[PDB]
Structures are given as structure tokens and as C-alpha cells.
Write a protein that binds this ligand. Structure first.
Ligand SMILES: */C(=C\S(C)(=O)=O)[C@H](Cc1c[nH]c2ccccc12)NC(=O)[C@H](CC(C)C)NC(=O)[C@H](Cc1c[nH]c2ccccc12)NC(=O)CN1CCOCC1
Ligand SMILES: */C(=C\S(C)(=O)=O)[C@H](Cc1c[nH]c2ccccc12)NC(=O)[C@H](CC(C)C)NC(=O)[C@H](Cc1c[nH]c2ccccc12)NC(=O)CN1CCOCC1
Ligand SMILES: */C(=C\S(C)(=O)=O)[C@H](Cc1c[nH]c2ccccc12)NC(=O)[C@H](CC(C)C)NC(=O)[C@H](Cc1c[nH]c2ccccc12)NC(=O)CN1CCOCC1
Lengths: 195, 236, 211, 211, 221, 211, 211, 195
């Protein structure tokens, strides 16, 4: 299973994922890069599930949003992007379902930093902190406890370090390799963390 | 099956079968067990036909588990059957509790089995008395004596078998608390030879410590027997 | 039933004297026992006199709300008038039955005002409840829906009082919802209560249990 | 259910919630999930309440007769072995039991997790129930063997609170007991988690908390 | 399998094919399906070979024990009772369809016994997968009071029909003629199938052509 | 089957002029495709004139061998004579059928010598094959068993030559076994061939494929 | 099947076994599991042979028309994307395909693993088939990017040999190709693993090797 | 799944296991001690499977062997011990099966250092190297390649280090904590390895 984590503050959004590409009982890669889909205009879709469905849905959404932005010479709002993604997932749920969980993060002037949690059933809601996978059970309470308003980026990264340590120590799958996307000060940064 | 009451009450209130089991015990060899600070010493009489019998085969001083040891007097076949029962019960206790069976528990079990055999139809009493030396759950050395009737009691030093009274009197006269290993072995040898003919091949001695039960070497027994003989000659 | 248990959630509606009230739980669940959000409102405003409380599968709630907003907006822009509460109720019934053999897993209620013209206008409380294929129960006192339906039915049968002002109506509906939620594992984590009056709407968040 | 126990420099801290449920219906909010097997052993139970209670009473009977016969207090390891063997004899019948036995014996403080499938794991920190993952995360993020009694009680209370907040099957009251060489104390007899939420997460109480 | 039996004047003639099959593969080319129960009683088996062999051996030895104890001639009715009671006890899970034929005080007798424990006294019968072809032949050609030679020819024709029309039947034709005073077991009776092509010379491998890793020789004493 | 495919394995037996031969594959499998051993012999000696080749589930092979050794040893110690090959074959049939409705998943062959007394003694080759419930095929040329039965049957039908000395018999049986094994995924990894002569036994390991 | 590929300082090393099977029967030992899609791309196939061959030919047709139209060579990434999209369109129909596409384009040496489930993983070292785990272990224990051509060929040959030795579904011959900037060479056209075993594991050939 | 590894040389036997106690999606302990069963007289039973069956079968076998050795005042041979274990597992297979894999290691003068591989179906055979679990697929070839006769204890430990590195890198379950039992020079040693 792929563990996704998302944290929204007043000045940032941090997304984190494990970097494992899994095929049966072997890890194809310890530095997988098929979970994050960065969309021009400070948006990010973090997907978790089977690699095939992940790739198909992520690329479909990214190309559709890029087409929208090119056709309209404008940046799609984060709320529009999240609900467009949810509408597409719901549309395909009853026909040929993608088995993907989504964390939709972004920034726009209208609504600031935004994080949306969506499951494979297309149940979506905007949240301050969210998680997907079997590691959600082990990181959700840490997020709840150590989250507060007016948190800083470095304090959020410390919370994420606690989460990664918990996933290494107590989770059945000893996950040690994580990728983080940080949105703050109208810039997007990539980090790689090993515990 | 056969369930006749073999052990019954005599008109005077006695169990003659139990008395006869005691007589069988008195017809056996002599076993002595002395306790010390954190170890025990058990000596037992040997009876071998020289040059034809194999000394190692017969064993009156046996080990039940990693920490309990036993000596007996009476009928060897009954002793063997009872000892196998006791070893099985040691391992059953270990399986059921995840801890080794303590000496008090094992002595209680042996006594219970002997009582049951005096009190069940179709069986006769075990004709053996036993001395069980071991450690308790608090790592404390202890010696228990069990009789054919099924009555058990803990002791500081005890002798069972033929002429057990003389050896018990000698022990009561010559016993001291917290002796060293060599002195305790000497005391056990003197007590047993109070009734057994003085000879290094007439006795088998073992020292039980938390680590294990170690049988005393023939040369050490020879030296101690020579010392006892010198003392006797001087006294006379 | 398992599909409704997946998320949980409950909606309630009550009428007073010249006022109505619609209440909902604020939880969003996952796998029937994991709480992912505590601000997932289940009450949606269609127009000033029409509110819909949707409980059930969250994706179906959002889809049905989008469809209903589309239909209501088109109707209102075409007619240059606000949609009637009865008309909206019938349209909701027909929309729900249009998916009869592959339905939306949503159990809605409609709460609002029926406007009657004579000079002045009379506002009449209006409550309807639905099953997932559009079967409609028109009621004058209270309507319930969701996984907490039995608890809400008991509380409303025991405690509902006819013809109450807005304050008494709010107290009654809040007590009913809180007591019913206290007995549900998969509902709660906050309660939202709206009190509709012909001239104003009062929105309140209740201090509820979060366990 | 959320039950947890952990060793620390002054003994063992045991904590539980008080919620029982059948399906999605909360049957009770005041059950007792910590029981005393004897003077020096506490068992926290999770899973099937009837199975847990019956088999803990059975273990208590066995321990009472053992103690009477042998004039010594049974060890936590021996009690755990007895319970695990008994439960294993019923493997494949549907028993639902997760028990943490924590107590003081001659070999110091001891803690064993026993399951209905015959498991027996010795450890320093255990958590069981549907909130066990949340309790585990909270305990692991802030555990230390050199915590004072007050700090340890606070940590256990916080872990139980977070488990109740995130898990729909846990809630009600939180109980925290302290096992020490001479017995056990009930530091928190039972504390409603309603106050804990508005002490920890929403102290201001000026808006609905957003998870 | 094709087994069959018929009653002629003062005799009972049983016949069988000799193929045992494990799925589509012939596991045995010359299996013996006619079994001696007593000097005046024989049987032919169809179904699961292990069940048939065990049951026939058990019946033979029980019948011999009964004959020794009663000091009289064994009875086909006794064999039928024992067999049917056993098969019924097992409820058809011993898959044994038996053609049991013998001569006793009541004259020649032929029985068909089925795995669930039913029996029927018949003038002729056939069982196995080739039973329908054998039955076609028997129905076409059977008549009462046939000579032993005519009955032998008819049994051979029936078994050959089964062999050549059923894929689960093959090999040779075994026959047994049972009278009140003797039995004649002809095995094989027909031998109608043989390998038709052979290579000009057999393939003898030259010595040392097989590579070996090690060779240990031990002497038996 | 699949239970036979779990391990694989094959045994073969051939007769010559005053000699017999028994061959087997040496692999031990797991999950039908994992090779864990390459020295798991399937030929067992009962006495000087009796050998049994057991193929099938490895646990059943070992169990059946232990039972057969027990029975043969008891028979021989009681009679003060070596067990006859026919007697052993019948005993094996009866033992296999004794588990008719919960059988051992083993397909055995018996290879040996029947001794006939007149002064001198005549050794007659003896071969039997079995199915798992004791159905017996007595043969004069060759017997096969295992998952490679079809390949072995084809090779032996094409290549078997009657009345061969020990050298030709060894070459023929080894060629048959190697060619049959080359076409089986779950059999091979070495071949063991025993040639029985009235005065000596020759044991050879073949240079086979290990893929 | 065992197929493997890895990047090293002088290009890409591609290696395969040559065994085909249906069930436990070895259908062939000389199939070709490496194909050339075009001049600068090699695909190694595992799983359903017919599916792999057909869809590789389809991809070759598409690449040929693309290159004819655009007067440029297609990239390994684009070919992998085309193949993965095509395979994904058939998800849920029963296709069995694992293809490693390794090639040289304007962005250097590239290698992608593509599955019938629509996966497309870019990487430096891949292995596929039933022997993939054994090949992976051997490659990981001794892989280095600065291996010479001879060392890399030896590593690939050893990995394929060990996969064939441990896995019953792999065997036959080992083929090793080298992809370099100007095309590809066949270093080992096909080498029987018989010699590989008796050169690696049992060079002495004095007895049967014990695994 | 529990990965067990066993290596037999002319002068040693090394057994290795992961030290995880697993309960659903969480690791109860990173230093589990319910897999090795040391038996007086230089014998060891390494078990893998469900913890309940593991405990029951391991303790049953250990107590039975200790009872035998106490009753007979002698050390049971390693072959007798292995086949006794296999006979008990086979006996219970058709009645109430233990779902346990076994590596039976030991030393005795008659036969030297011995290693036996047994699966939950009770299929046993003596081997020079063996493995159990889903990590067997990833360590078996390493054992095959780097094993040779006249190997030393330190070379065997190097092979085990390669195996542990492979299980950390490529195995779906990133296993990093292992316990080793080494029998050589008539002494049994315990080691703990972390990668
Ligand atoms: C923990 C939850 S969990 C998800 O981790 O299993 C609690 C632990 C618990 C609850 N109560 C006690 C009491 C003492 C010790 C521990 C306790 N477990 C539960 O609450 C159970 C969860 C199910 C999924 C196993 N629930 C129960 O056992 C029910 C208790 C109950 C039912 N009616 C009540 C009225 C009043 C108070 C309590 C209860 N009972 C059942 O569901 C069992 N039967 C099954 C047949 O149908 C009737 C209910
Ligand atoms: C007739 C065929 S039929 C279609 O009418 O059932 C024959 C009758 C027959 C064969 N051999 C004898 C011996 C004595 C008396 C009668 C005999 N029946 C068969 O050949 C069986 C037909 C199947 C459909 C049941 N075949 C068998 O029983 C197989 C024989 C066998 C297989 N391998 C062998 C090796 C050596 C010797 C014999 C055999 N056996 C099986 O099919 C095994 N199954 C296993 C499950 O339980 C049932 C038997
Ligand atoms: C690798 C094995 S695996 C376990 O990892 O899937 C090989 C890869 C392979 C084999 N052959 C080629 C050719 C070109 C490229 C790659 C190749 N896969 C297989 O061998 C297949 C394994 C199964 C489990 C999917 N086997 C096959 O596809 C069979 C090949 C075959 C069948 N008959 C033959 C005769 C001669 C040569 C080859 C074959 N085919 C099937 O199993 C398809 N079945 C056949 C029976 O009817 C239903 C369809």
C-alpha cells in the first residue's frame, strides 16, 4: 500500500508519499516517481493505488487541466481543479473505476493554500490534514496532536519526521524513503527524506 | 476392569497395605540428603556384584528436570515408574506455566500420586520412599521426603531406607547450618557409612547446585573414605 | 446498508410556528469507523425558501447536489422566479427515480417554506423525506433521514412540540439531534442547525461530542 | 475500543476507553475494560466483551486455586501462558479476545499481550482495539522510560483521547490505572472525553474545529 | 471396461476386456477383470479398480471361510447378499458394478450388482463403459438354452463389440465358463489387438552413451 | 491432481535378463516450481530383493516408507526369512486401500526379484505399479509412475527391448528417464538409477539437466 | 521465464532464458524472448507468449509508421507509453504481459518496464518472469555501473543460470545481448545451461550436487 | 511473513530469522523472540508462521525432546529430532494442522552439523542451505551462488549479510532486524544484526 500524507497551514501545503514502486513481493524501485502530478499554476495531485490506474488517471487529469489553462490563458482555481478531479473520478466509478486515492493541494489568491482529501469512492472534502493508505492509521493521530494554526513550514516538516519515524517503527511495511512537495511563498519545492 | 479395594482399613484403624509398603521400603538401600546454603548433597548406597555387574546401569540418584533431583529406597521397578511419571509432570508443568516446576510442587505431586495409589481400587501402594532436592521459585534450596503413605515433609537433612533411624540420629547430632561443599560431602559420607560398609564402591554421591547435579569423582570419594577410616581407627 | 454505513451521517427537519429548522451531523467517515473530516455539511441551500439535507454516500451527496443546483438554477433563470418548495420536492422525487435501477445512495429531506399570496404573503412550513428511489413522505411536524433514523424517530416522537417559536424549535431540534447522535458510532463529530424564519436565517454550530 | 499499557520507571500505566457497541449502535458508554485478576495483575480487554469477561473470570479462578495451593503469588508470565493455552484450545470457534496482562511479580514488572489465536507476546508497550493504531502512534511519538507518574498519566490520557477522536468505535470515558510494586491505583476513575476535546483541540470553543 | 455374462444350459459364461484407464491414458493393457470367488462362483468388475479388487478379495475369502465352516457348497445368493449389503453400507462410494455368475443347487445364476447395492437376477447382462455395445450384441443374438460353445462365441462377440466401439475398453478378451463341477478360465481368449508397426531393428544404445556422475557397486550376500 | 504437482517427482522400473532396474528423479519441489533439494531420493530398499519407488507428496512418501519398513521388519523378524516380493506387493496394496477415503497421495512402484527354489535358486524379475488406493498393475517389461507418467510411457513403449543384460538395461532405463525428465518442468534435477542383479547392486547418479 | 536488463557504463545488457511451458509440460526449450522492436530498441517478453508477441508486433507497426511519417527515431519512453496505453485499454480481459523495453535514443540509454495492467516504470535494472526474484538477488548482490562489457555479460549469464537452477519454469538456453549507441550485438546467441551448471556449481562432476 | 534462512557447512550451522512480531498492519515488536527454540544438546528449531501455532508447536516439541533426554539420560540425535518433529507435524496435518515452517539445525558426533528443511505440509529433507517465507525467493539464489564447501563461519556471515541487504533493498517488507544462531565448536552463539 502507498501512504500519502497532507498538511495544510495558513502559509503552506506539504504533501508526502512513500517512494516505492511495488510489483508483487518485490520493490521495483526505492525512488518511485509515479505518485506526484504537478500542474502548472501551483497545483499538485498526489495519487495512491495501482501503478496503472495511477498513471492513467494522473496523466488524464494533468493533460485536461493543462488544456483548460492553455485554452483560457488562465490558471485554474484549486477548488475548480479539485472538484473537476472528483467529478471525473465519480463519472468513472460506475463505468470503469480507477482505484486511486487523491490528495489535491494547491495555492491561489482567492482561497489561499488548499488541501482536499478524496478516496477511491470519490468522497471528497477540504481538510487541514489528511492521509491515505494503511499508514493513515498510524500518522493521522500524530497529525491531529501536533497540528496547530500558525504552524510554520519547519514545524510541519518536524511533524512529518515524526510521521515517517512512526511508519518506519510500527508499520508492517517498514517504509524509509519519502518524497515531499512543499508549496509556500508561491514556490514549489521537492525534498527527499530517508529515515 | 479390576477395581477391588486392595488397600482397606484394618479393625484397629490401620492400612496394612501401607504398612507392608513401608516394610518394602525398609528392605531397600540407604539414601541420605543434606541441605546447605544454596546447594544440596545426596549420597546413596550401591550394591554391585564385583567384576560382573555393570556399576553404571543401576541408578538410585536421578534427575527429574534441569533443577530437581531424586533419590529413593524400596522397589526399583516402582521407583522407575514413579520417576517417569514425575519427569512427565515436570515437563507438563513447564509447558503449562512457561516456568520450571519448583521442588515443593514436584514433591507435592509425588506425594499426591502415592496417596492416590493407596486410595484407588485395583492398585497397590508404591513400595518406595523418596528424597527430592531442588529449588523454589525464589531460588531457594529445599529437600522434601515422601513416604509410601503419601505424607511429605521438608527437611534440613534426612535419611531413608534400611537402618534410616541410625543415620537420622547421626545427622541430628552432626548437622550444622550453612556448611561448605566439602564439609557437607564429608558429613553425608559419614552418615551413610554409619550403616553401610566402609568402601568407596558402596556409595554414590552427587552435589546439586543451581547449575546442575554433579556426581562426585571416585578419587575424591576414595580420599574421603580413607579419611573416615583413619578417624574410625584412631577412635578405636 | 453497508454502503450507508461506509460514511454515516444524519439529517433532521422540524417545523414550528412560522419557522422551520434543519439540522445535520458534520462528520465524514471512511470504512465506517475512520473520521477524516469534521466539517462535512449535509445541508444545502437551493433558494431562500428551500433547503435540502442529503445523507448517505458522500460522492452521491455531492453529485445529487450538483444536479439539483443545475436544475434549480436553470428553472429559476428561465422563469425569472424562485422555485416553489413543492415543485422542487416533486423534481427531486423524479430525479431520484430516474436512476431507479442504479440509484444514488442518498436519503434526502426537503425543508422550507411554501408561499401563499392573498398584499401580504403567508409562509407555511414544508417538510418532506425521501427514500433513495424518490418515494416521498410529506409531513407537518418532523422528518428524519440517515443511519441514525431510529434514534431520531424516537427522540422526535417523544419530544416534538407543535407550534413553537424559533427559540423553542431550536432547543427541541438540537436536543433531538444531540441525543440521537450520542447513540451512533458512525455519526456526530459536530452538529449544524439552521433555523429558517421568513425574514432571517440563524446558523448555529452545537458544542457536541467528538468521540 | 482503545486499551493501552506501557512500562515506565515507576511501574506500569494502563488506560482504556469505556465504549461498547453492537454494529453501529452504541450499546453503552460506561463499561469497564480494565479488570483485576488478582492483587498484582490487571487485564485490559478488547474484542468480544462476553468472551473477554468469561475467560478472565476463568483465569482468575485458576489463579486463585493455584495461589491457595502453593502459598505464592502467580507470575504474569504463567497467567499469560494459562490464558493463551486455554484460548488456543478454542481456535476456530469464533472467540474474539485481545487481552493485555500487566502486573508485578518477583521478576519485576511484566506485560504480555494474549490473543484468541493463541498468541503470547512479552513487551514493554502494547495497545489493542480498533483505536490501537492511533494510540500506538501517540505513544510512540512521545514515549520515554523516565517519565514521572504525572507525565505518564498525561501521555496515556492523551493517547486514549486521540484514539477516541479518530475512531468511531472508541469513546465514552477514559480510565487510567497505575500498577506499582504494592498493588494498583486508579488515577483517573473515569473522565469524559467531551471535556478532553475542548481542553486539547478546541480550547477556544468559538467555532467548529476543522479536522 | 466391457464385462458381460450370460446363462447357457447348465453353465454361466463371463467375459471381460483387459484395459485399465487413468483418464485418457491406458495404465494397464492386460489387467484381469474376472475374479474367482469360489470353485463354482466368479465375478467380473467395472468401476474403480482398487475398490473392485479389494471387494472381490474380501468376498472370496469370506466365502471360503463360510464354506469351511458350513462344509457345504457356496451359494451365489450368499455372495449377492454379502456384496449388496457392503455396497449399500458404503452408499455407492465403493464404485463396483459386478456381474456375478455361479452354479449352485438352484442351477446357473447370473446377477448384476450396482455400486449403490441393488441386484438383479438376469439371463444375460453387461456392465462398464462398453456395456451398451455389448448389450446391443447380446440383445440381438441371445436365446435360451444355448450350447456352451455358442455362449462362448456370443460372449466373445459382445466383448469385441465393446472393445472396438468404446475408448475405455481394449486389450484381449478373457472368458470364464462356470459349471457345477468345474470352471474354465481362458485368459486370453481372443487377443484381437496388437501393435501393427515395428521398426526394422530395435534401438540398442551403445555402451557408455549415458554420462554418469558417480558409480557405487555393492555386493549382495 | 494439483497435490502431485506441488512436489513433482517420477519413478521408473524396467526388467532385463536376470536383472531389474529402478530409476527416480532426485528433486524436491515446493509450490510446484521452487526447487529446495536436489538429493531427495524416491527409491527405498525393503530387503535384498525388494525395492519400492514412491513418488507424490513428500510427506506421504516418508510416512508410507516408515509404515512399510515397520511392517516388513516385523514380518521378517517373526518369520526369520526375507519377505517375498509378491507378499510385499499385496501388503502394499492392502495398506494403500486401508486409507481408501483419505488416501496417501503417493503413486508407488515395486521392483524386485521373485525367488523360486528347485539346489540352485531362480531369480525372476518382478514389477508392479499402483494407484493411490492400491490398484495394482503387474507387468513384465516396465512400470512407471509420477507426474512424468505420459512421457515415461511413450519412451518405454518406443525404446524398451526385451531380455537385455545389465549394461543394456541400464542404458535403456537411463535414456528413457532422461528424455522423459527433459520435458517436465517439475521433475528432474538429477537422476538415480539402481540395477539389481542376483549377486550385486549397481548404484549410479546420472549427469542430468539441473534447470 | 527469466528476463533481465540493466544499464552499465557501456550501454544496456539484456538477457533471457529460452523455455516455454504449458502447465508442467515443457513445450519448447528454444523460444526467443528477446525481440527487436526497431534498430535501437529491444523488448524482452514474459508471461503469455502469444499476447507478448502480438502486441510487440503491433507496437513495431506503430513505431514504423511514426518513424516514416516524422523522419525521426522514436524514443523508448514514447514506445513504452504507447504499449502501456494499448495494454491498459484491455485491462480485465486476461492479457498476460511483462515487457522490458531497453533502447538508445537522443536522451541516452533508457529502460522501461511495462505490464498488462498499464504500468510503466522507468529504471536502471529490471527482471521479469517466474525467475525474476532469483535474477534480482543475483544482480543486486554484484551489480555495479562501472562493469566492463565482459564483466556485465558474465553477471547477466550467472543471474540467468541461477534463476533457471532454482525455478522450474525457466531453463533451456541463455541469450545475452548488448545494446550500445550504434545498435545491438548478440554476445551469447544461445548457451545451454547444462554446461553452465557443470561449470559453476559442480565442476568436479564426482558426485550429485547437494543443493 | 517470516523469513528464515539456514546454512550448513562442514564446521558450522547458521540459522537466521527476522525479529518482527506482526499483528495485522502493525509490528508489535522489532525484537521478537518467538521463532527460535533452543534445545539442550546442540539442537535448534527455527519456526515461521502464525505466532500462536509457532508457540504451541515449538514448546510442544521442546518439552517432548527435553522429556526424552531426561528419561533416557542422553542427548537425542539431530536426525532423530528432525524426524520426530516431522512425524508430529504430519500427524497433526490431517487433524488440526500447525501452519509452521521449520528449519531444524543441530550438531552431534555421529553425523556432524546437520540442517533440515521442513514446510507446513511436513515435506522434509536435509539440505546444505534453505529458506522459508517470501524472502526465500530473494535469498535462495544468493545462498546457492556464494555457498561452497570448506566455507568458514565468517564467510557464511558475509553471505548472510548479502541476504539481509537483499531483503532490505528488494523485498516488499523492508526487513532490517535479524537474529542469528550459530552452532560451531560445540558452542551456540546468538547474534543480532541490523541493516
Ligand atoms: C471494543 C471494541 S473492538 C471494535 O475493538 O472490538 C469493545 C470492548 C468492550 C466492550 N464492552 C466491554 C466490556 C468489558 C470488556 C471489554 C469490552 N468491544 C465491543 O464493544 C464489542 C465489539 C464487537 C464488534 C465484537 N461489542 C460487543 O461485544 C457487544 C456488547 C454489547 C451488546 N449489547 C450490549 C448492551 C449493553 C452493553 C454492552 C453490549 N455485543 C455483541 O455485539 C455480541 N453479541 C453478538 C450477537 O448479537 C448480540 C451481540
Ligand atoms: C473399467 C472401466 S469403467 C469406465 O467402466 O470404469 C475399469 C475396470 C477395471 C480396471 N482394472 C480392473 C481390475 C480389476 C477389476 C476391474 C478393473 N476401470 C478402470 O480402469 C478405472 C476407471 C476410472 C474412471 C475409475 N480406472 C481406475 O480405477 C484407475 C486404475 C489405475 C490408475 N493408475 C494405475 C496404475 C496402476 C494400476 C492401475 C491404475 N485408477 C484411478 O482412476 C484412481 N482413482 C483415484 C481416486 O479414487 C478412484 C480411483
Ligand atoms: C515465461 C514464463 S512465465 C511463468 O514467467 O509466464 C514464458 C515466456 C515465453 C514463453 N514462450 C515465449 C515466446 C516468446 C516470448 C516469450 C515467451 N511464458 C510461457 O511459456 C507461458 C506461461 C503461461 C503460464 C502463461 N506459456 C505459454 O504461453 C504457452 C506457450 C506454448 C504452448 N504450446 C506451445 C508449443 C510450442 C511452444 C510454445 C508453446 N501457451 C499457453 O500456455 C497458452 N495456452 C495453451 C493451451 O491452451 C490455452 C492457451
Amino acid at each position: 500500500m502507498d501512504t500519502l500524507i497532507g498538511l495544510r497551514g495558513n502559509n503552506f501545503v506539504v504533501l508526502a508519499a512513500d517512494t516505492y514502486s511495488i510489483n508483487s513481493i518485490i520493490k521495483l524501485k526505492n525512488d518511485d516517481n509515479t505518485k506526484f502530478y504537478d500542474i502548472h499554476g501551483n497545483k499538485c495531485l498526489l495519487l495512491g493505488g495501482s501503478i496503472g490506474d495511477r498513471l492513467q488517471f494522473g496523466e488524464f487529469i494533468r493533460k485536461n487541466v493543462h488544456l483548460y489553462q492553455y485554452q483560457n490563458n488562465t490558471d485554474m482555481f484549486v477548488k475548480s481543479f479539485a472538484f473537476f478531479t472528483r467529478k471525473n473520478l465519480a463519472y468513472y466509478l460506475r463505468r470503469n473505476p480507477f482505484e486511486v486515492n487523491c490528495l489535491i493541494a494547491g495555492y491561489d489568491k482567492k482561497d489561499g493554500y488548499q488541501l482536499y482529501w478524496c478516496d477511491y469512492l470519490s468522497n471528497m472534502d477540504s481538510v487541514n490534514k489528511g492521509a491515505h493508505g494503511y499508514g493513515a492509521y498510524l500518522v493521522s493521530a500524530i497529525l491531529d496532536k501536533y497540528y496547530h494554526e500558525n504552524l510554520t513550514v519547519d514545524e510541519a516538516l518536524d511533524i512529518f519526521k515524526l510521521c515517517f519515524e512512526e511508519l518506519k517503527k510500527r508499520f508492517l511495511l517498514t517504509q524509509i524513503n519519502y518524497e515531499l512537495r512543499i508549496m509556500y511563498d508561491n514556490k514549489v519545492e521537492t525534498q527527499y527524506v530517508t529515515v | 476392569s479390576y477395581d477391588r479395594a486392595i488397600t482397606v482399613f484394618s479393625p484397629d484403624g490401620h492400612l496394612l497395605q501401607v504398612e507392608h509398603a513401608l516394610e518394602a521400603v525398609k528392605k531397600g538401600g540407604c539414601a541420605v540428603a543434606i541441605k546447605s546454603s544454596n546447594f544440596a548433597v545426596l549420597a546413596v548406597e550401591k550394591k554391585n556384584i564385583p567384576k560382573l555387574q555393570n556399576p553404571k546401569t543401576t541408578e538410585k540418584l536421578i534427575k527429574l528436570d534441569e533443577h530437581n533431583c531424586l533419590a529413593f529406597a524400596g522397589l526399583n521397578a516402582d521407583a522407575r515408574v514413579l520417576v517417569n511419571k514425575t519427569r512427565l509432570e515436570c515437563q507438563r508443568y513447564y509447558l503449562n506455566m512457561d516456568e520450571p516446576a519448583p521442588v515443593d510442587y514436584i514433591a507435592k505431586y509425588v506425594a499426591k500420586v502415592q496417596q492416590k495409589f493407596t486410595h484407588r481400587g485395583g492398585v497397590r501402594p508404591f513400595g518406595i520412599a523418596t528424597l527430592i532436592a531442588g529449588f523454589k521459585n525464589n531460588k531457594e534450596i529445599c529437600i522434601y521426603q515422601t513416604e509410601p503413605s503419601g505424607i511429605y515433609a521438608a527437611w534440613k537433612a534426612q535419611a531413608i531406607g534400611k537402618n534410616a533411624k541410625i543415620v537420622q540420629e547421626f545427622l541430628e547430632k552432626n548437622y550444622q547450618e550453612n556448611m561448605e561443599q566439602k564439609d557437607c560431602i564429608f558429613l553425608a559420607l559419614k552418615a551413610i557409612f554409619e550403616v553401610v560398609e566402609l568402601s568407596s564402591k558402596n556409595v554414590e554421591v552427587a552435589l546439586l547446585t543451581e547449575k546442575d547435579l554433579t556426581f562426585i569423582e571416585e578419587q575424591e570419594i576414595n580420599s574421603m573414605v580413607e579419611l573416615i577410616d583413619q578417624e574410625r581407627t584412631k577412635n578405636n | 446498508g453497508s454502503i450507508y454505513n461506509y460514511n454515516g451521517g444524519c439529517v433532521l427537519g422540524m417545523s414550528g410556528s412560522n419557522c422551520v429548522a434543519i439540522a445535520c451531523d458534520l462528520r465524514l467517515g471512511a470504512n465506517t469507523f475512520t473520521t477524516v473530516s469534521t466539517k462535512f455539511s449535509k445541508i444545502f441551500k437551493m433558494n431562500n425558501n428551500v433547503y435540502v439535507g442529503l445523507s448517505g454516500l458522500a460522492t452521491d451527496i455531492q453529485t445529487l447536489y450538483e444536479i439539483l443546483r443545475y436544475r434549480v438554477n436553470l428553472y429559476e433563470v428561465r422563469q425569472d422566479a424562485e422555485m416553489d418548495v413543492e415543485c422542487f420536492a416533486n423534481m427531486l422525487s423524479s430525479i431520484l427515480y430516474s436512476n431507479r435501477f442504479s440509484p444514488y445512495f442518498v436519503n434526502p429531506i426537503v425543508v422550507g417554506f411554501k408561499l401563499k399570496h392573498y398584499k401580504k404573503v403567508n409562509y407555511e412550513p414544508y417538510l418532506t423525506a425521501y427514500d433513495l428511489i424518490g418515494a416521498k413522505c410529506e409531513t407537518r411536524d418532523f422528518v428524519v433521514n440517515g443511519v441514525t433514523s431510529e434514534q431520531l424517530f424516537g427522540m422526535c416522537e417523544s419530544l416534538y412540540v407543535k407550534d413553537q417559536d424559533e427559540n423553542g424549535l431550536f432547543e427541541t431540534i438540537s436536543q433531538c439531534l444531540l441525543s440521537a447522535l450520542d447513540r451512533d458510532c458512525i455519526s456526530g463529530w459536530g452538529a449544524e442547525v439552521l433555523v429558517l424564519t421568513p425574514e432571517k436565517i440563524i446558523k448555529k454550530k452545537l458544542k457536541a461530542r467528538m468521540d | 475500543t482503545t486499551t493501552l499499557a506501557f512500562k515506565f520507571k515507576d511501574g506500569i500505566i494502563v488506560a482504556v476507553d469505556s465504549r461498547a457497541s453492537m454494529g453501529s449502535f452504541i450499546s453503552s458508554q460506561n463499561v469497564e475494560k480494565i479488570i483485576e485478576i488478582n492483587k498484582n495483575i490487571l487485564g485490559t480487554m478488547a474484542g468480544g466483551a462476553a468472551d473477554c469477561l468469561y475467560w478472565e473470570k476463568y483465569l482468575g479462578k485458576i489463579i486463585k486455586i493455584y495461589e491457595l495451593r502453593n502459598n505464592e503469588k502467580i507470575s504474569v508470565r504463567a497467567a499469560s501462558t494459562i490464558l493463551s493455552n486455554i484460548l488456543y484450545q478454542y481456535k476456530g470457534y469464533g472467540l474474539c479476545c485481545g487481552i493485555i496482562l500487566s502486573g508485578y511479580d518477583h521478576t519485576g514488572f511484566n506485560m504480555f499481550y494474549v490473543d484468541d489465536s493463541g498468541k503470547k507476546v512479552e513487551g514493554n508497550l502494547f495497545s489493542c482495539g480498533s483505536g490501537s493504531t492511533y494510540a500506538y502512534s501517540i505513544l510512540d511519538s512521545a514515549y520515554d522510560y523516565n517519565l514521572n507518574l504525572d507525565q505518564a498519566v498525561e501521555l496515556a490520557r492523551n493517547a486514549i483521547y486521540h484514539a477516541t477522536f479518530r475512531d468511531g468505535g472508541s469513546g465514552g470515558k477514559v480510565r487510567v490505572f497505575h500498577i506499582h510494586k504494592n498493588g494498583y491505583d486508579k488515577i483517573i476513575e473515569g473522565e469524559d472525553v467531551f471535556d478532553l476535546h475542548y481542553h486539547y483541540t478546541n480550547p477556544e470553543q468559538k467555532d467548529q474545529y476543522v479536522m | 471396461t466391457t464385462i458381460c455374462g450370460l446363462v447357457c444350459q447348465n453353465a454361466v459364461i463371463l467375459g471381460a476386456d483387459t484395459r485399465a484407464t487413468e483418464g485418457p491414458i491406458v495404465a494397464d493393457k492386460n489387467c484381469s477383470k474376472l475374479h474367482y470367488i469360489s470353485k463354482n462362483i466368479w465375478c467380473a468388475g467395472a468401476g474403480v479398480a482398487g475398490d473392485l479388487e479389494h471387494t472381490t478379495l474380501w468376498l472370496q475369502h469370506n466365502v471360503e471361510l463360510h464354506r469351511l465352516n458350513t462344509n457345504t457348497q457356496p451359494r451365489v445368493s450368499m455372495c449377492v447378499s454379502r456384496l449388496t449389503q457392503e455396497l449399500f453400507k458404503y452408499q455407492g462410494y465403493k464404485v463396483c458394478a459386478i456381474v456375478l455368475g455361479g452354479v449352485d443347487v438352484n442351477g446357473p445364476q447370473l446377477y448384476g450388482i450396482h455400486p449403490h447395492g441393488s441386484s438383479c437376477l438376469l439371463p444375460f447382462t453387461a456392465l462398464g463403459s462398453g456395456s451398451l455395445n455389448a448389450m446391443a450384441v447380446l440383445e440381438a443374438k441371445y436365446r435360451d438354452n444355448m450350447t456352451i460353445e455358442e455362449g462362448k462365441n456370443l460372449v466373445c462377440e459382445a466383448i469385441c463389440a465393446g472393445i472396438f466401439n468404446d475408448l475405455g475398453s481394449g486389450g484381449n478378451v478373457d472368458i470364464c465358463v462356470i459349471t457345477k463341477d468345474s470352471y474354465q478360465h481362458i485368459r486370453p481368449y481372443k487377443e484381437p489387438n496388437m501393435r501393427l508397426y515395428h521398426l526394422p531393428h530395435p534401438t540398442i544404445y551403445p555402451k557408455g552413451t549415458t554420462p554418469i556422475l558417480s558409480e557405487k557397486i555393492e555386493y549382495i550376500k
